[PDB]
Amino acid sequence: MNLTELKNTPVSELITLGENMGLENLARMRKQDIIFAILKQHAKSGEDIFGDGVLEILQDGFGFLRSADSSYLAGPDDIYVSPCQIRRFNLRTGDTISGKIRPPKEGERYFALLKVNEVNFDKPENARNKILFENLTPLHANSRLRMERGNGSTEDLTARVLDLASPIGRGQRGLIVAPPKAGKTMLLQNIAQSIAYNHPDCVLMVLLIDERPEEVTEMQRLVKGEVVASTFDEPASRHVQVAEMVIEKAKRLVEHKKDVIILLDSITRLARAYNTVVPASGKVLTGGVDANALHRPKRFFGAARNVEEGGSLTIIATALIDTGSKMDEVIYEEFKGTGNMELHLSRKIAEKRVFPAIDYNRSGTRKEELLTTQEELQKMWILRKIIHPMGEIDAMEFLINKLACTKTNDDFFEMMKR
Amino acid sequence: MNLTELKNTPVSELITLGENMGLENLARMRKQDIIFAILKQHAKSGEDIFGDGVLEILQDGFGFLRSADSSYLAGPDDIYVSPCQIRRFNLRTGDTISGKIRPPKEGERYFALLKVNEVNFDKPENARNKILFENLTPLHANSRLRMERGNGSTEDLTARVLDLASPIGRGQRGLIVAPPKAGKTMLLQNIAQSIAYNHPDCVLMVLLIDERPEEVTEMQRLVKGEVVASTFDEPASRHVQVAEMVIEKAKRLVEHKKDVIILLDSITRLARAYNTVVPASGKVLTGGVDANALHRPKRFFGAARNVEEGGSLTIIATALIDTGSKMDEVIYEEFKGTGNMELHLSRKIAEKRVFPAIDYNRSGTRKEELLTTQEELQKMWILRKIIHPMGEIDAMEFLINKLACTKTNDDFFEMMKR
Amino acid sequence: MNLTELKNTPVSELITLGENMGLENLARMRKQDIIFAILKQHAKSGEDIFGDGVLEILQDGFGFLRSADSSYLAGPDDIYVSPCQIRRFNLRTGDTISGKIRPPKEGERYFALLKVNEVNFDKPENARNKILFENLTPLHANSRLRMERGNGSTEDLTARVLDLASPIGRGQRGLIVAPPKAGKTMLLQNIAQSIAYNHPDCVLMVLLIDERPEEVTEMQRLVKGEVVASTFDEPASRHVQVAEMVIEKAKRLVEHKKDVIILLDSITRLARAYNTVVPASGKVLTGGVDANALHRPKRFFGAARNVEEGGSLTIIATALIDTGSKMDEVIYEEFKGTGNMELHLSRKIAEKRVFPAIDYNRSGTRKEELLTTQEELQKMWILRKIIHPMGEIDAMEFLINKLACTKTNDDFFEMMKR
Numbered sequence A, B, C: 001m002n003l004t005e006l007k008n009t010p011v012s013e014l015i016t017l018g019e020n021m022g023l024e025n026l027a028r029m030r031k032q033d034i035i036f037a038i039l040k041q042h043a044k045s046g047e048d049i050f051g052d053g054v055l056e057i058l059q060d061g062f063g064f065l066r067s068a069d070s071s072y073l074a075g076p077d078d079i080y081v082s083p084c085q086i087r088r089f090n091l092r093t094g095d096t097i098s099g100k101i102r103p104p105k106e107g108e109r110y111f112a113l114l115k116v117n118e119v120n121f122d123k124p125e126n127a128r129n130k131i132l133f134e135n136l137t138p139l140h141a142n143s144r145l146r147m148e149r150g151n152g153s154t155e156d157l158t159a160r161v162l163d164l165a166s167p168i169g170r171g172q173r174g175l176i177v178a179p180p181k182a183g184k185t186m187l188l189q190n191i192a193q194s195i196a197y198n199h200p201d202c203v204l205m206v207l208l209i210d211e212r213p214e215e216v217t218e219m220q221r222l223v224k225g226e227v228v229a230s231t232f233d234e235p236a237s238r239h240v241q242v243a244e245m246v247i248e249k250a251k252r253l254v255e256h257k258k259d260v261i262i263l264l265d266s267i268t269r270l271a272r273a274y275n276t277v278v279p280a281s282g283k284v285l286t287g288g289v290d291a292n293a294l295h296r297p298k299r300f301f302g303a304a305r306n307v308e309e310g311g312s313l314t315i316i317a318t319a320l321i322d323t324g325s326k327m328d329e330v331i332y333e334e335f336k337g338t339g340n341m342e343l344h345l346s347r348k349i350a351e352k353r354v355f356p357a358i359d360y361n362r363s364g365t366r367k368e369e370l371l372t373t374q375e376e377l378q379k380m381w382i383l384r385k386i387i388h389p390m391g392e393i394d395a396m397e398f399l400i401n402k403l404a405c406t407k408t409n410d411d412f413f414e415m416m417k418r
């Protein structure tokens, strides 16, 4: 009944559904042809077909409804949008548009939408009355994003220690420093699982730029939520196009008072793609960086905020450091003072194969009093006076064994004193 | 048993085959996933498997057996060929090979061929004892190819005109010049049906480059022989890649003493693709083209010949004129006298809606005496003298009724005399 | 035993001769490498091997003895000559060098000449006693080349027309003007047969520039002399490389008092090739022809002369007109008042299937009184006074039938006066 529903429908049932109408030789045809044939079998008979997609506007008022499972890639299955649809209902990039799909006209290879039934998971008359995200008033992160799973496993301790190292709240524009071979991938999956566990209501999203497909498949199954990525073989134009429209989806949910969490890996690659896409300004930076190239990621990264009116937008990007590229240091420096949170994976402890390997002394955050309680920050203040005077390699080994024995971090906070 | 069987098989059989050895979740995943699963199912069990493909030689000696069905696009199913494999068994680009497939190693995403069974329908030892294509002795086309279908259909009437305008022999380097918007695509479709019916032994290959997918899909459904095509959506790097792959595969068939016919659409746009990929040389001719840019497309067009020792290589290409761009016009001027067969097309006939649409008086073939007989040529020559003073529009209108009122071209000549 | 014998040995026999030593898998290689491979078999045997070539001194100081059968292509069989070797015997480009060849040493990718047995069909010491070409005094041609076959055959009639239209003498810098499809190649084939038939003593060379591969092999099976060519698939620099090797080899034979005849097809193609190769001079004429580009082909065309010291140099270069390109028209405008004789072909006579299609009114030669006798020239003027009032086709038609009535032109002269 729904075009997107037929996409996930198993091919075994697709032939049976098509053959019930009276189709033929569906087994030999491709799955897309079977889906298109069912669209053809209802276009002639006048039967309405449902569907939905994410708006992807263009320069002439026309747009397409890209699919999340398609990584927002252009294709025949995308629902074409017309400039008239903007006149009927105010249209913005990243909008979730749902409605009955009309048959295409002559010369159109994409099925058009006769009318819109739902906008951003809500009625068009009510979704058009939402205040813009840019006109909102940002506020400091106050609602702490609890991450402690409490399972007692080794990976459970990882979520516990990140709360102790640098607390993360809703709308906190975080940032992490990743030296090569620091196990950054494992912690992100562990963090995402706790995100879906602790806060199933939030729209947890994962964005991967210039990443190998093996981790892309791993992210989709491990993360209990929508996962989008751009292949490492894709050109830089795809990387900037994917990332720009991802935040458009995130912003509309913020306009609908929905908490959004975006995991980015890596902002260094995203900045590198943006540098190669924009035209040269004539003034270059050290390491071969365009002057106005840094402006684009700032808008993307700077949007992460805890909106005072309602909802939040959290972006946790990954900074590539000590990777041997001169472009990596300049990107990190340009974003050094941008994020409200900093985490530094310890490569020295990584060579010791101790996971997680976090530089507790170097890592930290600002305005953590809002996230912490009256006594929560006091306990970690004592821990600050303990780990900092000594080395972090031995301290990380010390807390890992003690955190396993302790059930809760509050209970864990008591055992060092006694 | 064979990899190509898995690639071309209705999905219902793979579901049954997968469940035979206990493979599950077959309906949920895509068609290529179960193919990977079933192939890996035999990899663990040690069951013998087979495969085939068209060899693509890279700059390092490694290569992948590209698939003709996928327009020689990149894919996981391409069999990896090591640089030592081609040294153990002397192979070249475009060679059709088959054998047993070994499972990929860890860290390798492509299957490999441990042993080679057949090379272009021949043993690898016997195939390596074959004369190279370039060292052969080219000659004029002497074996006449019967273009007329003889069934009397409407498309047969179009076919009869070509025998009266420009006879085609084996290995003849033909050439078609045609302004757009004249139904050129369907005119070449009549050629494919005639050649396949009249000469099923000849390897009929059709290349479509830089065309809409609607015409690409129409070619496969209407041509019995192999068709390799790529749309203009792909970059020019694929255009040369899809053109170089086809001709090299065709060349090896000549070494196997087999006639091969290539139909190209279009050479004019093909040269532009070569004009873009070629690196800058510092000297640019008028119209934005480079002299070195036109060298390589000449080599592709110059490969057509009637080899005396055995086999042939017939190339028929269509040139685009009246496009309002100096890039296209300079190609026809450069490729003017290169082809033995020259068929002209005019929009004036196209406006008159006369099918076929060819400038009869100006079109002809050189060294046609080897193809036609003495009586046929004498009848042919008197036809040209009578048709010469008449205009292009009137010649076609006078000719169509004369051939329609008859059955065969030989019988058509009887009524012209009588 | 003999390198040049292996070069002319057919490739089918080359594989069989390679099995005499015991070497296998020579089929999947070029024709040049097969001779190179089998030479190494005899290199270890120590048997002296004979061979020859055409010297091409490189800019560094060494050179190679390119093979005429290889069309002066840079192949593995090119014998290397030390720069000191051209100091013992003063040699320049185009010298014919024959002698024994030593096996290559370690790291020597090319063979080497151990002894200079003969230079230009003479002793090496006698080679240094010949005056340079430019120091020779040019002179008007006076030794008539009797082009008439004398057998009264059908093809002899074409030679009868040419001798009646514009006599050719030793050193006559001819120029043939021909529109497309005017039966140009038929005339050149007819000329070449007559020259080798009537005058076997004079050295005959045929140069084909930008010619289809079908025609090159057709010519090599008819002309009883050296034939070199460069197909259009070869680069532009290859078009001028063979042309330089032809004139330089021709000049050396003039120094030894040998009449060398060069039939060129065509001067337009050679001029276009030279335009591409040479750098732009900043002064571009109409049609894209560089002003400084035409200095090189003129020198090639300007070498034809009747040297007073003995010998000559005859060049009959075909010119292309009405090709639809302004570049070809500019070239002809710079060679109009250059040739010693002209021969205009007419497409109109060709369309009437009258051969040879020679414009008798326009074609002619200058200072023809030196070639013919005072009475034969008087007879020729009678035909001039007859043809000139007539047309160009009817007079040509009148020429064909009257010439076919008799066997020799002097007999045709008798019947015209009666």
Ligand SMILES: O=C1C=CC(=O)N1CCN1C(=O)C=CC1=O
Residues within 6 Å of the ligand: A082, A083, A084, A085, A087
């Ligand atoms: O697109 C605009 C913007 C103003 C306007 O009148 N239109 C045309 C409306 N329109 C479509 O676009 C398709 C069918 C149809 O009636």
Ligand SMILES: O=C1C=CC(=O)N1CCN1C(=O)C=CC1=O
Residues within 6 Å of the ligand: C082, C083, C084
């Ligand atoms: O090869 C070069 C280049 C400059 C030079 O002096 N030489 C050596 C000359 N030389 C040979 O090579 C063999 C015998 C002989 O006298």
